[PDB]
Amino acid sequence: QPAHLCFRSFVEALKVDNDLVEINTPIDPNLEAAAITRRVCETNDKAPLFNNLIGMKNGLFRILGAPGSLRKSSADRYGRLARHLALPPTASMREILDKMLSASDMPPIPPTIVPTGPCKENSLDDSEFDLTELPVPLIHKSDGGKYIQTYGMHIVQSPDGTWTNWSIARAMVHDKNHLTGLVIPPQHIWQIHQMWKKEGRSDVPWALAFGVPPAAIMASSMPIPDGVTEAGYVGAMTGSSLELVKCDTNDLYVPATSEIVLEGTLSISETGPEGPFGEMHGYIFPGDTHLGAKYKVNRITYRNNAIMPMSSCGRLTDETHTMIGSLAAAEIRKLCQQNDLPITDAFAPFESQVTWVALRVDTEKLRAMKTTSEGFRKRVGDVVFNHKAGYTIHRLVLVGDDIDVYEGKDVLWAFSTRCRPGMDETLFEDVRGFPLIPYMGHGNGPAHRGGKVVSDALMPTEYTTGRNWEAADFNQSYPEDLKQKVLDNWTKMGFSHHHH
Amino acid sequence: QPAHLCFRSFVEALKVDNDLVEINTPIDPNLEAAAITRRVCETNDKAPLFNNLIGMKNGLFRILGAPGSLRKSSADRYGRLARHLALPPTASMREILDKMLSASDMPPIPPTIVPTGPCKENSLDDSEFDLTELPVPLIHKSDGGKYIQTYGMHIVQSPDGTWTNWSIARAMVHDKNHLTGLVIPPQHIWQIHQMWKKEGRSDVPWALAFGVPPAAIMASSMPIPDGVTEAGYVGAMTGSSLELVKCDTNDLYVPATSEIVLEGTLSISETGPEGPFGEMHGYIFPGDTHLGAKYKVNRITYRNNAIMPMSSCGRLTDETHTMIGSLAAAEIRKLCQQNDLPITDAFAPFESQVTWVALRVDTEKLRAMKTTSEGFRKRVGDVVFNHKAGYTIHRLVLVGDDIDVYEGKDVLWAFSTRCRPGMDETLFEDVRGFPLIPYMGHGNGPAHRGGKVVSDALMPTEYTTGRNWEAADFNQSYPEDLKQKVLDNWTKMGFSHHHH
Ligand SMILES: Cc1cc2c3c(c1C)C(C)(C)CC=[N+]3c1c([nH]c(=O)[nH]c1=O)N2C[C@H](O)[C@H](O)[C@H](O)COP(=O)(O)O
Ligand SMILES: Cc1cc2c3c(c1C)C(C)(C)CC=[N+]3c1c([nH]c(=O)[nH]c1=O)N2C[C@H](O)[C@H](O)[C@H](O)COP(=O)(O)O
Ligand SMILES: C/C(=C\c1ccccc1)C(=O)O
Ligand SMILES: C/C(=C\c1ccccc1)C(=O)O
Ligand SMILES: [K+]
Ligand SMILES: [K+]
Ligand SMILES: [K+]
Ligand SMILES: [K+]
Ligand SMILES: [Mn+2]
Ligand SMILES: [Mn+2]
């Protein structure tokens, strides 16, 4: 199976890429696995594969950390993400995001049902497992539970059967047969849960699949539209129908090569303590436990020598930055274009802790609109901040065509030099806010409302006659022939490789 | 003479440091010298010494580029600045700024007059020089003149004799015997010029000394208080009285080892075209010429084999960032402390294009104040933005004790995650603005007023009971013994030097 279609092949691909460290000596899931992974993520090192986890029994489980994190070299910086998608390891972020958007104007390719797969190699009924006895990691020292679920895909379906959603949402072990987790608006798992709650008749049939096809976990992390079944989107993106097998205890379908599958129900009535957790913005608030959604696990199925992927999330750079931020940015780019806004590119700068998105404007198109900053900012902010794709983003930075939004240094330069504080900004207090940002949920104002801004880093003539400056940099301040002479004589004179 | 007291020795020091490239083949002052220097600055390479400048005659002049720019390695990143001050090349920014502040609670050490020095080795009267015939550089292709003055010190004295100011302000060649330059409020050259204009009797006696003692050019770049003679401040800082020689045509005194000295007058009546110039924020606006101050040159004196220092300023990183920003930050730190504000550290992040200053708060002291964000931000902003030391700075970011303000990644993290847009900010529209920032002078609002903000990145409990989080990072999320184990086993397991 190809790497983008099968997690076990993905792990092989990482090895072949010299992008994997296999650790075959005993490693403690209580903090040690996650500490090693955290250090990987902070240093852009090779992904760790923990083959000898303390408390592993009867094949459950090994751990792969840092599945979607960054590589050290510039040339293949996003190579791990490229390996989720069948792209060359040198693929640019623009190419990755374009691949993730590609299915948005294609017919879905629905999944294909097959009778069995590797995920059925082993099973444990409700008399044979205990979640508290598995080597579930403690990821951060102050976490309020052992977070089994940091890189699996929740599967829930609308009551009418017409929408099956795949998404990542965190979850931790509650007891031998239950998890607690975040199920919050406006997320699709929450939207579907609300449909079942209004019906009021049963708990939500649910499955959680770990080590799914990489292309599927990327879609699971992206805010594709309401009502769109991720499996068909992933089929269109990859050009192939995904192979799924029915759960044993319910009628949901899981990827045939899933490493580990939990089957059960998401309660429409019960809650339990959840959190705190060391989160994407870089913080944990010890002791902040709150009631979360409660999942009952009825069955576990798993591959021989099952591997559990894990995100040791926090400060830069991990899957919560590379995937949450970038994929939200991609969806925002498309949303803007569909609303006739002249946006060419979008990215969530890592320097912003993926709380900003920089929007590159086609300023020729802008000029033809014959508008102003005040009007344009309001239009952009209304479109984005009133939509689910904008949920996680609190600052939009508008930049002109000279700025590469995928380069945080350039975004910061434009923001700092082209956007006059106050005057060139519009605040949005009557929009949904993202409570997980510390200044929201632990801040001075309402956790769930407001705190958003559009910052216009377009210069005045960009709306009228065109750019009226040149950068005071080597590229723009010197003629072509001079530049080339300097470069050609550089090492000759005495001054100081792409791949590396 | 020591390196910090003599520019010629400073150049030797750079050579000895392996921090100098001598270019002995012909180099064009029309763009080529500055292009090479620009590339140095963008790459943190060795400083260029142009010993064979096209149009050099009778000893005027060689050029040293990038005198105050950054080195590549982390360990000696600020080494060139350290060499201005007799500090070890590994000195931290905190140590550099502390050295620059040290004289603020010392008695001045006034200068010593000596009968001659190297600066008198050669002279040219007003029948023997023509400024248009010297190898003055064109620094950026769109500049409105040849900017002779990018790293010399203007010397002007109050009419009553009691204050002699040394400062850097740009100037370009107007004609054979005149310069034009920026003389703008609230700068001390402007304040003194206004005193002479009100007196109305004569033009201002003036000298411009290039290649001055390095410790003097650092003070020239710092907003030490009104009425304080820089020479005595530099004497106290260095522990030695500076040796000065009288000008030939007026009664001002210049450093004895100055490389090149221009003597003449700054007009109280005349102006001429000045600019545009590629400036510290990274831009040039071609064609934006405006009337500037006009200087008449009556005499040139210079060392044998004189060297002119040059700043090829623009995008990161050069003297306008390392010196303007950092030295302003230093003065702001002191100003805050003198106003009983609990600020421990200040720095202008390079990522902000030195338009922000991050202020580290002693939060124990803050807690004892029993205040709020709104009140505290207003107090801080009133103190700083109403003072000349705050002139160039448009955003203040307040951060707690966990943040190293000298590390831009950490400042950006705190700003993005702890300061709620709008609610946690106070805008200042009735303060002096810095027109050189593009969003000011080329923006949507008044060039000279407003556009400033205090952004509070202190979390709520920092004002009350204390920090209530831990970072989700390797350092804070894992116990000491674990961390050390991971580090000790790092290379053993398969994962990847201070000086580099
Ligand atoms: C990549 C990724 C995405 C997480 C995520 C993590 C990762 C690694 C964690 C597990 C390490 C930490 C928490 N995360 C949550 C999360 N969304 C959410 O609602 N709750 C979460 O707990 N997301 C974001 C969520 O996957 C995206 O917002 C999707 O758009 C949700 O899919 P949907 O659009 O179908 O609702
Ligand atoms: C380091 C440095 C400082 C420049 C400077 C440059 C450099 C290299 C240039 C030459 C490359 C470009 C322009 N600069 C000007 C400038 N201040 C000013 O009023 N006009 C200027 O043209 N400054 C800042 C000025 O030196 C500081 O604000 C001082 O505090 C002024 O001294 P004062 O406090 O005694 O007025
Ligand atoms: C960041 C996070 C949850 C989240 C992320 C994006 C959207 C919604 C919730 C968490 O579980 O720590
Ligand atoms: C930046 C700049 C002038 C300046 C700098 C700091 C304070 C005042 C003016 C210039 O000459 O380009
Ligand atoms: K999804
Ligand atoms: K703007
Ligand atoms: K000064
Ligand atoms: K705050
Ligand atoms: Mn969905
Ligand atoms: Mn002064």
From Swiss-Prot, chains A, B:
Cofactors: Mn(2+); prenylated FMN
Keyword Cytoplasm: yes
Outcome reported for the amino acid change (mutating residue 279 to Q): Abolishes catalytic activity
UniProt keyword list: Cytoplasm, Decarboxylase, Flavoprotein, FMN, Lyase, Manganese, Metal-binding
Top EC category: lyase
One GO term of the biological process aspect: cinnamic acid catabolic process
GO annotation, cellular component aspect: cytoplasm
Cofactor note: Binds 1 prenylated FMN per subunit.
Binding site for Mn(2+): 165, 188, 230
List of residues binding prenylated FMN: 165-170, 187-188, 230, 388
One GO MF term: manganese ion binding
Catalytic activity: (E)-4-coumarate + H(+) = 4-vinylphenol + CO2; (E)-cinnamate + H(+) = styrene + CO2; (E)-ferulate + H(+) = 2-methoxy-4-vinylphenol + CO2
Pfam family, one: UbiD
Family: Belongs to the UbiD family. UbiD-like/FDC subfamily.
Protein function: Catalyzes the reversible decarboxylation of aromatic carboxylic acids like ferulic acid, p-coumaric acid or cinnamic acid, producing the corresponding vinyl derivatives 4-vinylphenol, 4-vinylguaiacol, and styrene, respectively, which play the role of aroma metabolites.
Protein name as annotated: Ferulic acid decarboxylase 1
